[PDB]
Design a protein around this ligand. Structure first.
Ligand SMILES: OC[C@H]1O[C@H](OC[C@H]2O[C@H](O)[C@H](O)[C@@H](O)[C@@H]2O)[C@H](O)[C@@H](O)[C@@H]1O
Ligand SMILES: OC[C@H]1O[C@H](O)[C@H](O)[C@@H](O)[C@@H]1O
Length: 1180
């Protein structure tokens, strides 16, 4: 007794044969038992059609001879009736079986069938030379002469009106924001029906919800009544917008009575606050349904953005003084790409700060100063100050901030004077755009660009994917040379701007190159997604944007760790070949490499709690970098392209020569220094774990003619169970270079230890947790214990080019450590806080050659606070990127008690910074100017719904609407204490910083105004807060928003002022008029009746309606611009929607879901009919 489907999809029911009716559905099965689907089959004397997927019997039409015929569900042909086809079209067939066409009267009703014989529903036309609307239900012609609105003009005032009216028309008696009212506003009524018995004058604390007494429309009123009924306040009820106004008002009062009884019973109103809050979120105008939540682009993070507008008439506190330039990223600093995808994605997260405003620019510099002098200012400790910065989210802010930061460092530290000054304040950019490197270099390299081209290639060739990987050949970028000729090496001057940033095929330091940092992973690259995919994969969460708890994170982390360390060698979430990647990263010339905490220690749990399996290898590479890495570079592959010839291995060989050795063939230094002889390094790496060499094949490392006949020993060698690490010359296998300086390797190798036994080793691809491919690193034997191959930076003015950083051996001697993970657990104890640990362990990083320590952002997390909209992981994981107070870096509570960040107190931070200076390392401050989270104070902004670049969404009604945002800072926080304080001192000492014009604005920064308190006027926008398009209350009739700010310009519903509010439709000799629930006449506005029909009322206050012999199509231009367009109003004023309408001359048009005419496009139908609309609107 079940259906089963085959591999093909044929279906049996156990098998039944012939005509049968399993579960009441008529089906036909062939003699072999297969279920008939999507065809006419003949059973008995009646032909039946069976449906495509279900196989159930249904009406259908087929063409017999040349005439359409109709077949019903029972297989009988249809005569004198309507019958459908599978597509969904209805036809009518006469007594002779033949389909009818055109205008037809049957059974005393008139239907319109088009040429194809399709019954047309929701179709307006002058059919009999007289208007006729064909029903949406059955297609039956009505004259559309009867008015469909059910609500006549009625007065609402009665004996309770003066009691429930507002005590006062001002901020005393009305909960409000900037004067405006909200759905969840409570107010002070004149009197209170205490206990449902006796009316008594109200006391100032006797506040009541506005929704107890007033509603924006009948739909909302009916929903309120039904909702409150369901909570014990009434016998559960169903009311509709169609219910009479009188009945709804009476029912509101019986609910009011019941409410006052439960207030007396509970002696509280908090239960009601929660009931109203809940109810309000139920309504679409007061929730995200009217906010157009979307997830494409950066909207993926939080669900969509609102851009604030400069609107001095309604919302003047929120005006930006014409300073809200969006998307001025480096490539668009001047707005010249505003109309293209080259406009920057200004909106990223939370409240987006307006960094195009000179006043805000000054404040960002104040903050920058505070960070670079944090120790001096907060502990009077001149050794506890940050040395350099990381600029977060470069492409999501105004690029002026780069110049501001650059020039500040020039002024205060003379970074443009020497490499020693510059390199004492190492500064990096998170600048992802592929054209940022060239911009950064044109602007003098004030901060180091990242080099994504190399990070990307690690992804393709090693780091990503179990198998199909780009060849190691791609690391060379041979196109750099003309014709890709590795023999002739003529640089291609006319190259297409496509390639890796720094060529390393034969890098002798002779050509100028763009200084940069590079990495394999980051706190925000190849971490956050895998870690979440793992949680999703094990059912811990459902979505990437899902909120998770720390325990949820801990459980997921256990699977992540299990996958990372899998002995199989396969990795589902984690990256492959990280050792091999680091080997290349750490040997490359002309880069400052950066190392990720999470490749050295586990990304979760406690800080430095447990090393990763990669730790030993990376640690060795790092120490070897200090000893051996210097001089020129070469790089080659046993490969010529995408595809491999017979002998070819695609094994990459990277070499460094030693201090002053720049070339393969250079035999000695120009200054006759000897340091080079025991320096240099050789790296061999493969991406093929199933690699086997031919017996003939030999693989060579050209260590250089400065290293003829020299003995080399292994640092690191891969094998089938792991990667061996050799700590000193004695414990490793040796091998000697030939006369030309080449180390030769074969399929089979017999190496000898310098002293001790022989060793056997195969050039063999391996597969295990540490590698999927090959890795060999070789170093010269005889290296001193204190050997240091690094170059000190020079104090002389090397360059008059104006530039700050220069890619050279001194810059290359640096190493940045990104020393945190976003997924660290919260400290279990004060002693295990990241910054305490960093202080005790500073030593360890000095010996790995770290010259600059990139610390996590130290700002106080906004945490679980959430005023609306989607929370982001930065906030609930307390990682420091999401913060309320920019100057609170772990200060104590005002009561004296400790109040650490996730990383510890402010003292812990100053101690951590000092400890790094005691060990000769710099400390990097994360500068995060793009946004700020969870501001506790509300303001009313004028907002438009936009995508990441601040462009209005295409099909949105959310345009210039009033919205309550959380934009105002407490005014009593550390932003209030330290805001703008250091600027005056700075203007006095370095006037030019304050006189220099910025590019995007034409203006200099403006310190004449200090920011102690944030507010909307300094913001570009916000992520959508799920409050609704009309949470700020508005009268539908006049479209004016209620307000009580100034007694001269009050606007309230008339009930609340104890005046008479009449509401409904009323006819007069001229036409039909409408009065809203608040008692105002509708003018120049669209109005919806209780049955769902829509009407437009013109300037004069009269419903628009079509006349006989005239065009029913009318052009509407309203106060509400988004609704402008061409509409089709019938004689009873009803707007045609989602259907075709004929004009007086016989032309057909189509009108959409919302009544607007559609032009210049194709349009589809539920029955699969296609139509075209010309530009003038007509239907071809
Ligand atoms: O991203 C740096 C990269 O740029 C070019 O190659 C791009 C891309 O070429 C194909 O799509 C391959 O499938 C990828 O692996 C390459 O990344 C340069 O040709 C390449 O040398 C360089 O690494
Ligand atoms: O619901 C289970 C379904 O299995 C199949 O796909 C059969 O064709 C269908 O008749 C049935 O209802």
């Amino acid at each position: 007794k079940s259906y089963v489907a085959d591999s093909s999809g044929q279906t049996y029911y156990f098998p039944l044969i012939g005509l049968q009716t399993i579960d009441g559905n008529l089906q036909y099965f062939n003699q072999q038992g297969v279920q008939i689907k999507g065809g006419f089959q003949d059973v008995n004397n009646k032909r039946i059609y069976f449906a495509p997927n279900t196989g159930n019997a249904v009406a259908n039409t087929e063409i017999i001879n040349g005439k359409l015929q109709g077949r019903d569900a029972n297989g009988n042909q249809v005569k004198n009736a309507f019958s459908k086809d599978v597509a969904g079209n209805t036809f009518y067939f006469d007594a002779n079986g033949v389909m009818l066409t055109g205008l037809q009267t049957i059974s005393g009703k008139t239907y319109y069938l088009d040429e194809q014989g399709h019954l047309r529903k929701n179709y307006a036309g002058t059919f009999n030379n007289q208007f006729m609307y064909f029903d949406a239900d059955t297609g039956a012609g009505k004259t559309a002469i009867e008015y469909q609105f059910d609500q006549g003009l009625v007065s609402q005032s009665n004996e309770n009106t003066p009691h429930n009216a507002a005590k006062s028309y001002d901020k005393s008696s009305f909960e409000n924001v900037d004067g405006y009212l909200t759905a969840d506003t409570w107010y002070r009524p004149t009197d209170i029906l205490k206990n449902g018995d006796t009316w008594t004058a109200s006391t100032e604390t006797d506040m009541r919800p506005l929704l107890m007494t007033w509603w924006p429309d009948k739909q909302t009123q009916a929903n309120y009544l039904n909702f409150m009924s369901s909570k014990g306040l009434g016998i559960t009820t169903t009311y509709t917008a169609a219910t009479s106004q009188k009945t709804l008002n009476d029912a509101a009062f019986v609910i009011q009575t019941a409410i006052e009884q439960q207030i007396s019973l509970k002696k509280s109103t908090e239960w009601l606050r929660d009931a109203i809050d809940s109810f309000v979120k139920t309504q679409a105008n007061w929730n995200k349904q009217t906010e157009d939540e979307a997830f494409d682009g950066l909207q993926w993070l939080q669900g969509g953005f609102l851009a604030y507008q400069d609107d001095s008439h309604r919302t003047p506190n929120t005006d930006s003084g014409n300073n809200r330039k969006l998307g001025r990223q480096p490539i668009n600093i001047d707005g010249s790409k505003d109309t293209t995808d080259g406009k920057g994605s200004e909106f990223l997260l939370a409240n987006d700060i307006d960094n195009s405003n000179p006043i805000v620019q000054a404040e960002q510099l104040n903050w920058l100063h505070y960070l670079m002098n944090f120790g001096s200012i907060t502990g009077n400790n001149d050794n506890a100050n940050f040395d350099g910065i990381r600029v977060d989210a470069v492409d999501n802010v105004d690029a002026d901030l780069l110049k501001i930061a650059g020039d500040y460092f020039k002024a205060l530290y003379g970074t443009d004077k020497s490499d020693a000054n510059a390199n004492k304040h190492l500064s990096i950019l998170e600048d992802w755009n592929g054209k940022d490197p060239q911009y950064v270099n044109q602007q003098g390299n004030a901060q180091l660009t990242m080099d994504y081209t190399v990070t990307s290639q690690f992804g393709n060739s090693l780091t990503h994917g179990a198998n199909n990987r780009s060849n190691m050949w791609y690391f060379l970028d041979t196109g750099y040379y003309l014709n890709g000729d590795l023999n002739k090496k003529i640089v291609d001057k006319n190259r297409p701007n496509s390639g890796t940033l720094v060529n390393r095929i034969a890098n002798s330091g002779d050509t100028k190159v763009i200084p940069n940092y590079s990495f394999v992973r980051a706190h925000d690259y190849d971490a956050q997604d895998p870690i979440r995919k793992a949680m999703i994969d094990h059912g811990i969460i459902k979505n990437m944007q899902d909120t998770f708890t720390f325990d949820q994170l801990a459980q997921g982390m256990e699977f992540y760790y299990k996958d990372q360390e899998n002995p199989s060698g396969f990795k589902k979430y984690n990256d492959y070949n990280l050792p091999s990647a680091y080997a290349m990263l750490l040997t490359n010339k002309d880069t400052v490499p950066r190392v990720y905490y999470g490749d050295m220690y586990l990304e979760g749990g406690q800080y430095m709690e447990k090393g990763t399996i990669y730790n030993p290898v990376i640690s060795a590479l790092l120490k070897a970098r200090i000893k051996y890495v210097s001089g020129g570079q070469t790089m080659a592959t046993d490969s010529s392209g995408k595809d491999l010839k017979d002998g070819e291995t695609d094994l990459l060989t990277s070499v460094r020569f030693g201090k002053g050795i720049m070339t393969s063939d250079q035999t000695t230094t120009q200054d006759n220094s000897q340091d080079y002889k025991n320096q240099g390094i050789g790296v061999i790496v493969g991406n093929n774990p199933d690699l086997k060499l031919n017996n003939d094949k030999t693989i060579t490392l050209h260590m250089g003619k400065a290293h003829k006949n020299q003995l080399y020993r292994a640092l690191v060698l891969s094998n089938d169970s792991g990667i061996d690490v050799y700590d000193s010359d004695d414990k490793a296998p040796t091998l000697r270079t030939n006369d030309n300086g080449d180390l030769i390797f074969h399929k089979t190798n017999t190496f000898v230890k310098q002293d001790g036994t022989i060793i056997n080793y195969e050039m063999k691809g391996s597969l295990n947790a540490l590698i999927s491919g090959y890795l060999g690193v070789w170093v010269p034997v005889g290296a001193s214990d204190s050997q240091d191959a690094r170059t000190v930076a020079t104090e002389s003015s090397s360059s008059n080019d104006g530039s700050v950083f220069h890619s050279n051996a001194a810059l290359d001697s640096n190493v940045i450590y990104e020393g945190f993970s976003n997924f660290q657990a919260m400290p279990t104890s004060p002693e295990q806080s990241t910054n305490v640990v960093i202080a005790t362990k500073a030593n360890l990083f000095k010996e790995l050659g770290i010259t600059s320590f990139e610390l996590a952002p130290q700002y106080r997390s906004s945490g679980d606070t959430n005023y609306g909209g989607m929370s982001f992981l930065d906030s609930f994981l307390n990682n420091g990127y999401a913060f309320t107070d920019r100057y609170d870096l772990g200060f104590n509570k005002a009561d004296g008690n400790p109040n650490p960040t996730k990383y510890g107190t402010d003292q812990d931070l100053r101690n951590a910074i000092e400890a790094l200076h005691k060990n000769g390392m710099q400390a990097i401050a994360d500068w995060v100017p793009d946004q700020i989270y969870a501001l506790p104070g509300k303001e009313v902004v004028t907002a438009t719904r936009v995508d990441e670049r601040g462009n209005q969404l295409k099909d949105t009604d959310f345009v210039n609407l009033l919205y309550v945002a959380n934009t105002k800072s407490s005014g009593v926080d550390y932003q209030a204490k330290y805001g703008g304080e250091f600027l005056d001192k700075l203007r006095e000492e370095y006037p030019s910083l304050f006189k220099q014009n910025q590019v995007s604005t034409g203006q200099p920064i403006d310190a004449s105004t200090k920011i102690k308190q944030w507010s909307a006027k300094y913001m570009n926008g916000t992520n959508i807060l799920h409050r609704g398009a009309y949470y700020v209350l508005k009268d539908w009739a006049t479209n004016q928003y209620f307000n009580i700010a100034k007694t001269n310009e009050v606007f309230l519903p008339l009930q609340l002022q104890n005046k008479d509010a009449q509401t409904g439709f009323i006819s007069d000799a001229s036409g039909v008029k409408y009065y809203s629930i608040s008692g105002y006449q509708a003018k120049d506005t669209f109005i919806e009746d209780g049955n769902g029909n829509w009407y437009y009322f013109d300037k004069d206050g009269y419903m628009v309606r079509s006349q006989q012999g005239e065009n029913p199509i009318r052009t509407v231009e309203t106060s509400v611009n988004t609704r402008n367009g061409n509409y089709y109003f019938m004689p009873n004023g009803v707007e045609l929607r989602k259907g075709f309408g004929t004009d007086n001359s016989g032309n057909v048009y189509y009108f959409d879901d919302q009544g607007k005419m559609v032009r210049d496009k194709y349009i589809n139908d539920d029955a699969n009919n296609f139509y075209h609309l010309n530009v003038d609107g007509t239907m071809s």
